[PDB]
Design a protein around this ligand. Structure first.
Ligand SMILES: [Fe+3]
Ligand SMILES: [Fe+3]
Lengths: 299, 321
């Protein structure tokens, strides 16, 4: 599974670009940043742009990583104790813009009005309040779910990995695949009540899988069996991928499940800190759930 | 209706970019070109980039034109007698790349495997044996309006039409939906799965168990306050019992028919069509068949290449079927 290691010159060029940008927009608010985003993304190092696009276009791998970003730890500051109540944009605004630029290379950034206050870039760090994660397709129930996740690791001193599992077809039978291609399954939130678990090409299928929230009508034994077989193959295939400081992990939400592994936090500002941006290939597809034509939040 | 008008200096910058790219790349058969496409597109004048981006994101207008490109007539050469058998790419390769660049601004170019030898940029010019047809290479016959591939879940999101020449100013017809001409009651109905749209014999896996099942679908979708549409009056079927749906369709057909605009894509005009917000066609005209005839290039744009994966041979092909 491909990765890209940045030269310091690429990293410095990325840093310099996002810092400049940070001083020229001062918010995800103004629609002009949202407008200029893909043009800005073309100011990224060219091999970085070409690598990402090859990943998107090859439509082959579950994830890739661009590593060796320069994320200034002094400028970024301590890992916050909460994300609610912070003055945004923070010191880490450049890094947030970096992921917004990457999102514009894959498609479009979007969010949910309900999730993390409606911020297009959200925070993943330990909170002392929320001290209490298996694996899944992000928002498997939703037809307007993300096409890619982008996870930028601002810091990860203890090297806590993300689980990422692709789909190994060879260990399934033509029968189960056929059955998994049929609207015979229910996936629950957090017309058309049933749907398929596999779609796309029958020879290299896409998946939407959320075990905890996946049930199948009791009388349909074939669908129960194919689902259990699929779950087992994906669970057996799970890999651990570490997003270290300066790494940006890209997850293809149609080709890979993802999960967090538990770890012990210090709660002192040294803890793992990731940023997340959800990516859609088509913003207009979710139009019915967006208050306006311009808003990138669903709900 | 918005439009952008290039200064000769911008058109010259665009001209020499496309010539640079034509020299640098083999064809569209070049997978590295297809890869570099959006990076390359960012080299176009920034006013042009921002314009198309505002059009895309505004998601309001059914079409726009970028006017004033320099399409070097002597370099492009005579309009062909056919599209078949031409050495590919031809001298007009820079103009093809131009459209591919715009396609990368809006989304992804894609083709149909069985149309024009699988070329990602189509030719539109009169061919004598095609005189009686309602198709691109037609002339005499009125191209009646429609959403492109209304019945199809993987129809284009955008059409790009580039006029290499249009000496007699034959207009393209494009019609949008004037919402204030529909009653609320009618809009609500047209949003409901109450219509069948019939396949064309050109696209006759899933599409199979869709032709088979004849599923009722809507004619309007997206936002109720500013809806997208798929409307092909030739293929649109309404169940005879459904009085409300028939009434609603008659109204929709009515309003769209009343709103047909004549848009002349003249030499150097690139016309952009939102296949979710506008129907299209072309007025009849008389061809000269001498090599001076109206010649347009066409690129089809998808916002999501992977949505049509089931109907593409490989992961890498941009050709459906
Ligand atoms: Fe998740
Ligand atoms: Fe058409």
């Amino acid at each position: 599974t491909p990765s890209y290691s940045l030269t310091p010159a690429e990293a410095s060029a990325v840093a310099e670009l996002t810092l400049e940008l940070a001083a020229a927009y001062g918010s995800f608010g103004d629609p002009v940043l949202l407008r200029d985003l893909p043009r800005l993304a073309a100011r990224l190092p060219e091999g970085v742009q070409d690598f990402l696009r090859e990943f998107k276009l090859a439509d082959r791998h579950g994830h890739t990583v661009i590593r060796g970003h320069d994320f200034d730890q002094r400028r970024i500051g301590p890992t916050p104790d909460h994300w609610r109540g912070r003055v945004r944009p923070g010191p880490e605004f450049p890094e947030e813009l970096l992921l917004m630029l990457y999102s514009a290379l894959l498609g479009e950034p979007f969010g949910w009005a309900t999730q993390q206050d409606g911020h297009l870039v959200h925070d993943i760090f330990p909170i002392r309040s929320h001290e209490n994660l298996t694996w899944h397709t992000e928002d498997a129930f939703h037809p307007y779910r993300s096409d890619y996740l982008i996870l930028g690791a601002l810091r990860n001193p203890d090297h806590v990995p993300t689980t990422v599992g692709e789909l190994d077809l060879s260990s399934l039978s033509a029968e189960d695949i056929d059955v998994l291609f049929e609207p015979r399954y229910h996936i629950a939130p957090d017309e058309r009540p049933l749907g398929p678990l596999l779609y796309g090409s029958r020879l290299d299928p896409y998946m939407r899988l959320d075990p905890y929230f996946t049930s199948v009508p009791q009388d349909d034994t074939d669908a129960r069996r194919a689902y259990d077989a699929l779950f087992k193959v994906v669970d057996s295939g799970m890999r651990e991928v570490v997003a270290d400081q300066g790494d940006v992990l890209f997850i293809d939400n149609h080709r890979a499940v993802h999960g967090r592994l538990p770890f012990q936090a210090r709660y002192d500002g040294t803890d793992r800190w990731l940023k997340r941006v959800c990516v859609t290939s088509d913003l207009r597809r979710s139009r019915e759930m967006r208050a306006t034509s311009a808003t990138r939040l669903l709900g």
